[PDB]
């Protein structure tokens, strides 16, 4: 099968920032990739449109995906309240890596993070499932609104999102 | 040595509701019981005075102790960020049992729950460290401000706390 | 993020011997680097300034970091009493390797050692987290105050410390 590409249109406080597209590695982690694709299209009745990036730490990552509580305590997968850690084939090799946030082994829901650096200490604890295809400059722009403890100064929102291929 | 006894004066919004006193089983879980006792006196410079019970589910338990984020994502022990599950000798045997809340094994901080029912499905996963000595009637009164999801209707506060014996 | 550089200004009783700088591998062991870094600036209220290297064995290592008991039975981390062994990605590859001393698995506090030789027999038991950037000759000078039992001949002291980069 061919790997899907999803996009996010980011908006800082209302103003459009730009678009990030991501390649989802369905050829390595199909169930994890499908969860993200489906929450991006919004085809199951919920997903990421309108959710915000609740925690951004410059030179580390931008964490988002909590469309239910918007603060890191929620989110859900299309498979249920949580799903298994599919496998750990891909590693946190550089900036632009998309990986699952979790609350310990096998608690995957909807929260994810985009690495702005290589985060190899996280290898084997978080499932890597995608990479930024276009728009790294928008992620780099997003970084600038975060602080050492993660609070953003402006509301970074996924204004729209969906699938491209 | 002797088992300490601490008290909590509960206030619904601002009105005094009453006192609950607890025996802490320092003779079974000395490190877990010293943590709670010190956070109740505030002797290490921080603790439960002023915090709230953020999650109350009637017929189950009252949860509190998050004096940093006040919503369930914080708290800390006198030993650091988190500490080890001391042992699982004692069981959740009925109403009045005071036990540690956590985020999986060995993440004890300061959050606790007072059981308003026997919760044996929690045995072996949460460390039991005390029991209500007096004021079980006040705990039953607190229950009434909860709901099935745990959100309260009034802010239940530990207006005061300290050691007795 | 970027790897911190910290410095120590070593004093042998009176006269300054010199400055050793260290690169801390925050790209491999972020939680262990931040501990040394924060304890070197002293930003959290306590730290390394004024402590001594209490055990130096020539041709093996210089050990210091016990700022509370000064003899090897103390120290504490910014995270508390002790903290986990983060990972053992890095090995003890040669002189000027900076690694955590411990009292067995997951008992890291503040004590560390500066290797003056390749200690590979310690791989897997001690978390390596930094390397002497500039200043190896000052460490080689410190060496000559030890003995096979670790006794220092003169009072080696970290006169000042902080973060460069």
């Amino acid at each position: 099968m061919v790997n899907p590409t999803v996009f996010f249109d980011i908006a800082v406080d209302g103003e459009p920032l730009g678009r990030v597209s991501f390649e989802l590695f369905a050829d390595k982690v199909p169930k994890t990739a499908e969860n993200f694709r489906a929450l991006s299209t919004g085809e199951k009745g919920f997903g990421y449109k309108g959710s915000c990036f609740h925690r951004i730490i410059p030179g580390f990552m931008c964490q988002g995906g909590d469309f239910t509580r918007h603060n890191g305590t929620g989110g859900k997968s299309i498979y249920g309240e949580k799903f298994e850690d599919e496998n750990f084939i891909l590693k946190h090799t550089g900036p632009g890596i998309l990986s699952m946030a979790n609350a310990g082994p096998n608690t995957n829901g909807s929260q994810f993070f985009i690495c702005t650096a290589k985060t190899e200490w996280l290898d084997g604890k978080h499932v890597v499932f995608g990479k930024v295809k276009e728009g790294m400059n928008i992620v780099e722009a997003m970084e600038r609104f975060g602080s050492r403890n993660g609070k953003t100064s402006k509301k970074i929102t996924i204004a729209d999102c969906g699938q491209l291929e | 040595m002797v088992n300490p006894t601490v008290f909590f004066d509960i206030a619904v919004d601002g009105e005094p509701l009453g006192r609950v006193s607890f025996e802490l089983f320092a003779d079974k879980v000395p490190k877990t019981a010293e943590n709670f006792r010190a956070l109740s006196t505030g002797e290490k410079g921080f603790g439960y005075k002023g915090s709230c019970f953020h999650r109350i589910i009637p017929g189950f338990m009252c949860q509190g102790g998050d004096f940093t984020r006040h919503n369930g994502t914080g708290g800390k022990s006198i030993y650091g960020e988190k500490f080890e599950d001391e042992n699982f000798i004692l069981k959740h045997t009925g109403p009045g049992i005071l036990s540690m809340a956590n985020a999986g094994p060995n993440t004890n901080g300061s959050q606790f729950f007072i059981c308003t029912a026997k919760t044996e499905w929690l045995d072996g996963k949460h460390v039991v460290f005390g029991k209500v000595k007096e004021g079980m009637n006040i705990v039953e009164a607190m229950e009434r401000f909860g709901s099935r999801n745990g959100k309260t209707s009034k802010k239940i506060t530990i207006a005061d706390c300290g050691q007795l014996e | 993020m970027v790897n911190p550089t910290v410095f120590f200004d070593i004093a042998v009783d009176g006269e300054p011997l010199g400055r050793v700088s260290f690169e801390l591998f925050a790209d491999k062991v972020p939680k262990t680097a931040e501990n040394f870094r924060a304890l070197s600036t002293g930003e959290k209220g306590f730290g390394y300034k004024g402590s001594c290297f209490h055990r130096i064995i020539p041709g093996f290592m210089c050990q210091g970091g016990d700022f509370t008991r000064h003899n090897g039975t103390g120290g504490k981390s910014i995270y508390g009493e002790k903290f986990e062994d983060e990972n053992f990605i890095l090995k003890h590859t040669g002189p000027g390797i900076l690694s955590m001393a411990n009292a067995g698995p997951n008992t890291n506090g503040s004590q560390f050692f500066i290797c003056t030789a390749k200690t590979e027999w310690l791989d897997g038991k001690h978390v390596v987290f930094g390397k002497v950037k500039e200043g190896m000759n000052i460490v080689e000078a410190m060496e000559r105050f030890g003995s096979r039992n670790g006794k220092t001949s003169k009072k080696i002291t970290i006169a000042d410390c902080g973060q460069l980069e």
Binding site: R55, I57, T73, A103, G109 | A103, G109 | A26, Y79
Partner: peptide, 11 residues
């Protein structure tokens, strides 16, 4: 420290 968890965030 530098971790990414959902709910109890540690150092």
């Amino acid at each position: 420290x530098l971790l990414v968890x959902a709910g109890l965030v540690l150092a």
